[PDB]
Symmetry: C2
Subunit: 105 residues, 2 copies
């Protein structure tokens, strides 16, 4: 329901797609539609809006391939931030378990 | 990263209130203990978040010396369940993505 949370989910998925490898928008949508067994088919226009913010923040970069297609790549700024995230969100999952357990105590 | 820092802080607070109604200093203690001192929330940061959450019906407050108690509303429990599901769905989308690769 929280608008800000769907946008976060869509970023998390995308940054993983690019983590598995460099890709083009069409390839990205197919893979998300495939991996979500069809529930999630992102439209190209919202994607281009999202990748626009990411290059602006240096998380990914762009280039051309080979017909010929435009590919996106995860940079270190991205790889690192994606690592920083997993650790920070690991602490959160742990804080919660410590809460749940102290409730039993 | 602020957008992740405020989000993480919100998830924690709302989980404390799921454990039970509690007052601001009691919430900071629990968070400080559950993080073994890593995350020590300041009183003002809580009041800044609880005002946004109370405006949205996610929590409400009441009085019970005397302390101000915060409670997760039905909307909050509900939204928090809908959320944990929507966030669990992502985990599989990703595994299916990594798995398809």
């Amino acid at each position: 329901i929280p608008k800000e949370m769907l946008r976060a989910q869509t970023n998390v998925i995308l940054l993983n797609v690019l983590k598995q490898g460099d890709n083009y928008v069409y390839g990205i949508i197919k893979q998300v539609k495939e991996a979500s067994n069809g529930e999630m088919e992102l439209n190209e226009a919202t994607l281009y809006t999202i990748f626009k913010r990411l290059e602006k923040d240096g998380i990914i970069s762009s280039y051309w391939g080979d017909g010929r297609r435009k590919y996106y790549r995860l940079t270190e700024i991205g790889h690192e931030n994606m690592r920083l995230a997993f650790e920070s969100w690991s602490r959160v999952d742990k804080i919660i378990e410590n809460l749940e357990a102290n409730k039993k105590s």
